[PDB]
Structures are given as structure tokens and as C-alpha cells.
CSV table of C-alpha atoms and ligand atoms in Angstrom, one decimal:
chain,number,residue,atom,x,y,z
A,1,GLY,CA,-4.8,1.6,16.5
A,2,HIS,CA,-5.4,0.6,19.6
A,3,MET,CA,-7.3,-2.9,19.1
A,4,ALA,CA,-4.6,-4.0,16.5
A,5,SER,CA,-1.9,-3.3,18.9
A,6,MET,CA,-3.3,-5.1,21.9
A,7,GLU,CA,-4.1,-8.0,19.8
A,8,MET,CA,-0.4,-7.8,18.3
A,9,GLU,CA,1.2,-7.4,21.5
A,10,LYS,CA,-1.1,-10.4,22.9
A,11,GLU,CA,-0.1,-12.9,20.1
A,12,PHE,CA,3.6,-11.8,20.6
A,13,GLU,CA,3.4,-12.7,24.5
A,14,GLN,CA,1.7,-16.0,23.5
A,15,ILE,CA,4.2,-17.3,21.3
A,16,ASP,CA,7.1,-15.7,22.9
A,17,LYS,CA,6.3,-17.3,26.7
A,18,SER,CA,5.6,-20.7,25.2
A,19,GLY,CA,8.7,-21.2,23.4
A,20,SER,CA,6.9,-21.2,19.9
A,21,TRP,CA,9.0,-19.0,17.6
A,22,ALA,CA,10.7,-22.3,15.8
A,23,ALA,CA,7.7,-24.2,15.4
A,24,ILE,CA,5.7,-21.1,13.9
A,25,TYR,CA,8.5,-20.3,11.6
A,26,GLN,CA,9.2,-24.2,10.5
A,27,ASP,CA,5.2,-23.9,9.6
A,28,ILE,CA,5.4,-21.0,7.7
A,29,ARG,CA,8.5,-22.7,5.5
A,30,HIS,CA,6.1,-25.5,5.1
A,31,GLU,CA,3.2,-23.6,3.8
A,32,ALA,CA,5.2,-21.2,1.4
A,33,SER,CA,4.4,-21.2,-2.4
A,34,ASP,CA,6.6,-22.4,-4.9
A,35,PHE,CA,6.3,-21.4,-8.3
A,36,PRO,CA,8.7,-21.7,-11.4
A,37,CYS,CA,12.2,-19.6,-11.6
A,38,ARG,CA,12.7,-20.7,-15.1
A,39,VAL,CA,14.1,-17.4,-16.3
A,40,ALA,CA,16.5,-17.1,-13.2
A,41,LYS,CA,18.0,-20.3,-13.9
A,42,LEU,CA,18.9,-20.3,-17.6
A,43,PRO,CA,22.6,-20.7,-18.1
A,44,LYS,CA,23.1,-17.0,-19.6
A,45,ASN,CA,21.9,-15.9,-16.3
A,46,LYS,CA,24.3,-17.7,-13.8
A,47,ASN,CA,26.6,-14.8,-13.8
A,48,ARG,CA,23.3,-12.5,-12.7
A,49,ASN,CA,22.7,-14.7,-9.7
A,50,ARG,CA,24.7,-14.2,-6.4
A,51,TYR,CA,23.3,-17.2,-4.7
A,52,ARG,CA,22.2,-20.3,-6.7
A,53,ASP,CA,19.4,-20.9,-4.0
A,54,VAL,CA,17.7,-17.7,-4.2
A,55,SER,CA,15.9,-16.9,-7.5
A,56,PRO,CA,12.9,-14.8,-8.4
A,57,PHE,CA,9.9,-16.6,-9.3
A,58,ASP,CA,9.1,-16.0,-13.4
A,59,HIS,CA,5.6,-14.5,-12.5
A,60,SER,CA,6.9,-11.7,-10.0
A,61,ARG,CA,10.0,-10.8,-11.5
A,62,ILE,CA,11.3,-7.2,-12.5
A,63,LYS,CA,12.2,-7.1,-16.2
A,64,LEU,CA,14.8,-4.7,-17.7
A,65,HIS,CA,13.9,-2.7,-20.5
A,66,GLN,CA,16.2,-4.5,-22.5
A,67,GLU,CA,16.4,-6.4,-25.6
A,68,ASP,CA,19.8,-8.4,-24.9
A,69,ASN,CA,18.7,-9.7,-21.8
A,70,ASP,CA,16.0,-8.4,-19.4
A,71,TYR,CA,17.0,-10.7,-16.2
A,72,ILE,CA,17.9,-9.1,-12.9
A,73,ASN,CA,17.4,-11.0,-9.2
A,74,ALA,CA,14.6,-8.7,-8.2
A,75,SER,CA,11.4,-9.6,-7.4
A,76,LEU,CA,8.0,-7.1,-7.1
A,77,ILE,CA,5.9,-7.8,-3.9
A,78,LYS,CA,2.8,-5.9,-4.7
A,79,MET,CA,0.5,-6.2,-1.7
A,80,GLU,CA,-3.4,-5.5,-2.5
A,81,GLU,CA,-4.8,-4.6,0.7
A,82,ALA,CA,-2.1,-2.3,2.2
A,83,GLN,CA,-1.6,-0.7,-1.3
A,84,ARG,CA,2.1,-1.1,-1.0
A,85,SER,CA,4.5,-2.4,-3.8
A,86,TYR,CA,8.1,-3.1,-3.2
A,87,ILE,CA,11.2,-4.3,-5.2
A,88,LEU,CA,13.0,-6.8,-3.3
A,89,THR,CA,16.6,-7.6,-4.8
A,90,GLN,CA,19.9,-9.2,-4.1
A,91,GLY,CA,22.8,-7.1,-3.4
A,92,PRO,CA,24.2,-5.8,-6.9
A,93,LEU,CA,27.2,-7.8,-8.2
A,94,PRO,CA,30.3,-6.3,-9.5
A,95,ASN,CA,28.8,-7.1,-13.3
A,96,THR,CA,24.9,-6.1,-12.2
A,97,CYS,CA,25.4,-2.7,-10.9
A,98,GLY,CA,24.1,-0.9,-14.1
A,99,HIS,CA,21.4,-3.2,-14.3
A,100,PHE,CA,20.6,-2.6,-10.6
A,101,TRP,CA,20.4,1.2,-11.7
A,102,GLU,CA,18.8,0.3,-14.9
A,103,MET,CA,15.9,-1.3,-12.7
A,104,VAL,CA,15.7,1.6,-10.4
A,105,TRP,CA,15.2,4.3,-13.3
A,106,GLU,CA,13.1,2.2,-15.5
A,107,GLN,CA,10.9,1.3,-12.1
A,108,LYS,CA,10.7,5.2,-11.3
A,109,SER,CA,11.8,4.4,-7.7
A,110,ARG,CA,12.4,7.3,-5.4
A,111,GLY,CA,14.4,5.3,-2.5
A,112,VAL,CA,16.7,2.4,-2.3
A,113,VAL,CA,16.8,0.5,1.0
A,114,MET,CA,20.3,-1.1,1.9
A,115,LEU,CA,20.3,-3.6,5.1
A,116,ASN,CA,23.9,-4.9,4.9
A,117,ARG,CA,27.6,-3.5,4.8
A,118,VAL,CA,29.4,-4.1,1.6
A,119,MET,CA,31.6,-6.6,3.7
A,120,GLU,CA,30.3,-8.5,6.4
A,121,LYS,CA,32.1,-11.7,8.4
A,122,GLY,CA,35.1,-10.8,6.2
A,123,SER,CA,33.3,-11.4,2.8
A,124,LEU,CA,31.8,-8.9,0.5
A,125,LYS,CA,27.9,-9.3,0.6
A,126,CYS,CA,27.4,-6.7,-1.8
A,127,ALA,CA,29.0,-4.6,-4.5
A,128,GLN,CA,30.3,-0.7,-3.9
A,129,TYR,CA,27.4,0.4,-6.1
A,130,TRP,CA,27.2,4.0,-5.4
A,131,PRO,CA,29.9,6.9,-4.9
A,132,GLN,CA,31.4,7.3,-1.8
A,133,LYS,CA,32.8,10.6,-2.6
A,134,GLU,CA,31.1,13.6,-4.1
A,135,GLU,CA,33.9,14.4,-6.6
A,136,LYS,CA,34.0,10.7,-7.7
A,137,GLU,CA,31.0,10.0,-9.5
A,138,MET,CA,30.3,6.3,-11.0
A,139,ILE,CA,29.3,5.9,-14.8
A,140,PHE,CA,27.8,2.7,-15.8
A,141,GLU,CA,28.6,2.4,-19.3
A,142,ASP,CA,26.5,-0.8,-20.5
A,143,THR,CA,23.1,0.9,-19.2
A,144,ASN,CA,24.3,4.5,-19.8
A,145,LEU,CA,24.1,6.0,-16.5
A,146,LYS,CA,25.5,8.2,-14.2
A,147,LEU,CA,25.3,8.3,-10.6
A,148,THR,CA,26.5,11.3,-8.2
A,149,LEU,CA,27.0,11.3,-4.4
A,150,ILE,CA,25.3,14.7,-3.6
A,151,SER,CA,25.2,14.3,0.0
A,152,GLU,CA,25.0,12.0,3.2
A,153,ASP,CA,23.6,12.4,6.7
A,154,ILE,CA,25.5,10.1,8.9
A,155,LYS,CA,23.6,8.7,12.2
A,156,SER,CA,24.2,6.2,14.7
A,157,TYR,CA,21.9,3.3,13.2
A,158,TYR,CA,21.5,4.5,9.4
A,159,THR,CA,22.9,6.8,7.1
A,160,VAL,CA,21.0,8.7,4.5
A,161,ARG,CA,22.1,9.7,1.2
A,162,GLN,CA,21.1,12.0,-1.4
A,163,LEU,CA,22.0,10.7,-4.9
A,164,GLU,CA,21.7,12.5,-8.5
A,165,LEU,CA,20.8,9.5,-11.1
A,166,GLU,CA,21.4,10.7,-14.8
A,167,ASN,CA,20.1,8.8,-18.0
A,168,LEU,CA,22.8,9.8,-20.2
A,169,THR,CA,21.0,9.3,-23.1
A,170,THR,CA,18.1,11.3,-22.7
A,171,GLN,CA,20.1,13.9,-19.8
A,172,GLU,CA,17.0,13.8,-17.6
A,173,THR,CA,18.3,13.7,-13.9
A,174,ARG,CA,16.4,12.2,-11.0
A,175,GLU,CA,16.9,12.5,-6.9
A,176,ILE,CA,17.3,9.0,-5.4
A,177,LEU,CA,17.4,8.8,-1.6
A,178,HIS,CA,19.8,6.0,0.0
A,179,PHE,CA,18.5,4.9,3.4
A,180,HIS,CA,21.4,2.5,4.8
A,181,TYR,CA,20.9,0.8,7.9
A,182,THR,CA,24.4,0.3,8.7
A,183,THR,CA,24.1,-1.6,12.1
A,184,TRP,CA,22.4,-4.7,11.5
A,185,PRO,CA,24.9,-7.2,13.5
A,186,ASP,CA,27.1,-9.7,11.7
A,187,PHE,CA,25.1,-12.5,13.5
A,188,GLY,CA,21.2,-12.8,14.9
A,189,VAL,CA,19.2,-9.4,14.8
A,190,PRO,CA,19.5,-5.7,15.8
A,191,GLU,CA,19.3,-5.3,19.8
A,192,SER,CA,17.1,-2.4,19.2
A,193,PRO,CA,13.8,-2.9,17.5
A,194,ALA,CA,13.2,0.5,18.0
A,195,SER,CA,16.1,1.1,16.2
A,196,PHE,CA,14.7,-0.5,13.0
A,197,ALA,CA,11.4,1.1,13.0
A,198,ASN,CA,12.5,4.4,13.3
A,199,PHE,CA,14.3,3.7,10.2
A,200,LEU,CA,11.4,2.2,8.5
A,201,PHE,CA,9.5,5.8,9.7
A,202,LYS,CA,12.5,7.9,7.8
A,203,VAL,CA,12.1,5.9,4.6
A,204,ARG,CA,8.1,6.7,5.0
A,205,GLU,CA,8.8,10.1,6.0
A,206,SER,CA,10.8,10.9,2.5
A,207,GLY,CA,7.5,9.8,0.5
A,208,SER,CA,9.7,6.8,-1.3
A,209,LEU,CA,6.8,4.2,-0.1
A,210,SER,CA,4.2,6.4,-1.5
A,211,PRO,CA,2.1,5.6,-4.4
A,212,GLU,CA,3.2,9.0,-6.3
A,213,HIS,CA,6.7,6.9,-7.0
A,214,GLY,CA,7.8,4.0,-8.2
A,215,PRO,CA,8.0,0.8,-5.8
A,216,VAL,CA,11.1,1.2,-3.2
A,217,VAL,CA,14.1,-1.2,-4.0
A,218,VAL,CA,15.2,-2.9,-0.8
A,219,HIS,CA,18.1,-5.2,-0.7
A,220,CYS,CA,20.2,-7.0,1.4
A,221,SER,CA,22.9,-9.7,0.5
A,222,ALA,CA,20.0,-12.2,-0.7
A,223,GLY,CA,16.9,-9.7,-0.7
A,224,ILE,CA,15.0,-12.1,1.3
A,225,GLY,CA,16.1,-12.3,5.3
A,226,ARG,CA,16.8,-8.6,6.2
A,227,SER,CA,14.8,-7.4,3.4
A,228,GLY,CA,11.9,-9.6,4.1
A,229,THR,CA,11.7,-8.2,7.6
A,230,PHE,CA,11.7,-4.3,6.5
A,231,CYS,CA,8.7,-4.9,4.2
A,232,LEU,CA,7.0,-7.6,6.2
A,233,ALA,CA,7.1,-5.2,9.2
A,234,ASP,CA,6.3,-2.2,6.8
A,235,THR,CA,2.9,-3.8,5.6
A,236,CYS,CA,1.8,-5.0,8.7
A,237,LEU,CA,2.1,-1.8,10.3
A,238,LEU,CA,-0.2,0.0,7.5
A,239,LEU,CA,-2.8,-2.7,8.0
A,240,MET,CA,-3.2,-2.1,11.8
A,241,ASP,CA,-4.2,1.4,11.1
A,242,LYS,CA,-6.4,0.3,7.9
A,243,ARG,CA,-8.6,-2.3,9.4
A,244,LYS,CA,-11.8,-2.1,11.2
A,245,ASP,CA,-13.4,-4.8,13.1
A,246,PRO,CA,-11.7,-7.1,14.0
A,247,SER,CA,-8.8,-4.6,13.6
A,248,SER,CA,-6.0,-7.3,14.4
A,249,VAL,CA,-3.3,-8.1,11.8
A,250,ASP,CA,-1.9,-11.7,11.4
A,251,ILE,CA,1.7,-11.5,10.6
A,252,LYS,CA,2.0,-15.1,9.6
A,253,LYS,CA,-0.6,-14.5,7.3
A,254,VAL,CA,1.1,-11.3,5.8
A,255,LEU,CA,4.6,-13.2,5.4
A,256,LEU,CA,2.8,-15.8,3.5
A,257,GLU,CA,1.4,-13.8,1.1
A,258,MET,CA,4.5,-11.7,0.7
A,259,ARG,CA,6.2,-15.3,-0.1
A,260,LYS,CA,3.5,-15.7,-3.1
A,261,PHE,CA,5.8,-12.9,-4.8
A,262,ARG,CA,9.6,-14.0,-3.7
A,263,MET,CA,10.9,-17.3,-2.0
A,264,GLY,CA,12.5,-17.4,1.4
A,265,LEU,CA,11.3,-14.1,2.9
A,266,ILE,CA,12.5,-14.0,6.6
A,267,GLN,CA,15.2,-16.3,7.1
A,268,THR,CA,15.2,-17.5,10.6
A,269,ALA,CA,12.9,-17.7,13.3
A,270,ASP,CA,14.8,-15.0,15.1
A,271,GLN,CA,14.1,-12.6,12.2
A,272,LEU,CA,10.5,-13.8,12.5
A,273,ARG,CA,10.5,-12.6,16.3
A,274,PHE,CA,12.3,-9.2,15.5
A,275,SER,CA,9.4,-8.3,12.8
A,276,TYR,CA,7.0,-8.7,15.6
A,277,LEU,CA,9.0,-6.5,17.8
A,278,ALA,CA,9.7,-4.0,15.3
A,279,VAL,CA,5.9,-3.8,14.6
A,280,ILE,CA,5.2,-3.4,18.1
A,281,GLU,CA,7.5,-0.8,18.7
A,282,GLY,CA,6.4,1.0,15.5
A,283,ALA,CA,2.8,1.1,16.5
A,284,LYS,CA,3.4,2.7,19.8
A,285,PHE,CA,5.5,5.2,18.4
A,286,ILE,CA,2.2,6.1,15.9
A,287,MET,CA,-0.1,6.0,18.4
A,288,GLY,CA,2.1,8.9,20.7
A,289,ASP,CA,2.3,6.4,23.8
B,301,CL,CL1,20.7,-19.5,-21.7
B,302,CL,CL1,-1.9,-6.5,2.0
B,303,CL,CL1,29.0,-0.6,3.9
B,304,CL,CL1,18.8,-14.3,12.4
B,305,CL,CL1,22.0,-9.9,4.8
B,306,CL,CL1,-4.2,-10.7,8.4
B,307,CL,CL1,12.6,-20.4,3.9
């Protein structure tokens, strides 16, 4: 509400004017939790990790319902006070797309949030894990899942797709919404915080963040930088509406809470700054400003 917005904008101005983003961001890095990632580092899981230096903590990792190997590079971020949960995961690999959709099915997720393009900077950031044409569905034979593109709505800053995910073992089918933010720049942060806040509102409006469903699945390439920005802004905005007096929300403390559940969330000072901007813009929109 009004008081939380005022204090947020105030704290932003003070950091910005004093050139403090890099120092604040270094502090967060220094203070952040360290927990073991023993399962991620097992030799049999080397081909399930996109990056050697980005791993889920054992305590918060998502387990596939698999006797063979339950490992996927994905973490449950559980925000107690805000009453929101998110699964943050790396962009699927060629050999982990079946695992990805198994996780979506097992966790009962309604939405998938993608914040990168399959190719960026001339390199593959993520496998093509969803079908691009209605008439060419995908079958994941290892996990017995079928995935059909039903429709897509292409907007200037993002695309929304309706997907149909079918468990071939049981023939149950589910509608999954794919919220694809397609315009994050190859370097730096988006020029429009408002486009990103608007994107977050479209995800919220679909019910994908709601407790009736399993946690939304959020990914970029490593699942920590852009993905961290998305969930940090969402949680901060919720808290700004939930809290009484003082109504103020401390973004650094919220980010440190989130980093208890996955390492490295928010990978640059510029992403920290962008996070504040998206929250500020989002709150103005909510208040009808
Ligand atoms: Cl092993
Ligand atoms: Cl919280
Ligand atoms: Cl893409
Ligand atoms: Cl950046
Ligand atoms: Cl990325
Ligand atoms: Cl706080
Ligand atoms: Cl870091």
C-alpha cells in the first residue's frame, strides 16, 4: 500500500544517488547462505547440470518420483510470510526435457515462466523443450509424457502459450500455461521495468501463482539471475500489500531469505537495481496511481 511504496521509492533513491548498488550487492553475496549440494555433485548427475557452478542445495532440491535417479537441477523456494512458493530451475538440457515435464507433472504446476530465448549471444541457452507447431507434438519417451501446443498469443514483450501435457501412462491431461518473456536483452537488464512488472501481472492473473496449484516453474539459462529477479519482485510486491505498520519491505532481506533455498539468486548489481524498479512500477500499477 501507500506507506510501503513510499518507503520503497525512498530507499531506492538513497541507494541510487549514493552509487551504492555494487556495494550492497557485494554485501548480499558475502552474507548469503551456503549449504551442501552433494546430490548435484554426484558423478552420475554431471550430465543433468548445465553449469558446474550452479547447483541446487540438497535441503531444497526438487526430487523426481523416480527409483532410477531422482535428480533434477531445481529448487523449491518457499516464502513463508508471503505464502508463495516457486520452483527455480535451469533451462532444460537436450537430455533433461523429459525430467523437466515430469517435474511439472509431479509438482502439479499450472504455469512455466521462461525468461530467456533458446539462443542468446550465439549460443544455446536452453533446449527447445516445447512444440513450436500445433501439428507437431512432442513425446518424452523416458518419462511417458506428451506435449501439444494448443495456441499462443505473441505480444511485443512476451508470448503466452497454452500447452496440453498428457501423462501417457494414465491418459490424464492438463493445461499448462507457458509465460515467455522474450525481450530480455542479450546484455544488461530490460529498459522497461514496466514491461517486466506487466509480465508478472499476466502470470499472476492466470492463477499460476495461486495456492490451488503446485508451485510455478521459473527458469532462465542457469535459473538464478533473471529467475531470481522474477520471484524476488513478486514476493516483495505481495509483502508490500500484506504488512501493516511498519508497512516497509526490505528487498535485501527478502533476497537473503530466498538465497537460503537456491544459491546465487540475482547475479549482478544491475539485476538488483532492476528488481527495485520493477517492484516500484508494479506497486504504482496496483494502487491505480
Ligand atoms: Cl554417482
Ligand atoms: Cl516471505
Ligand atoms: Cl526462444
Ligand atoms: Cl545484468
Ligand atoms: Cl539467462
Ligand atoms: Cl523485509
Ligand atoms: Cl552470487
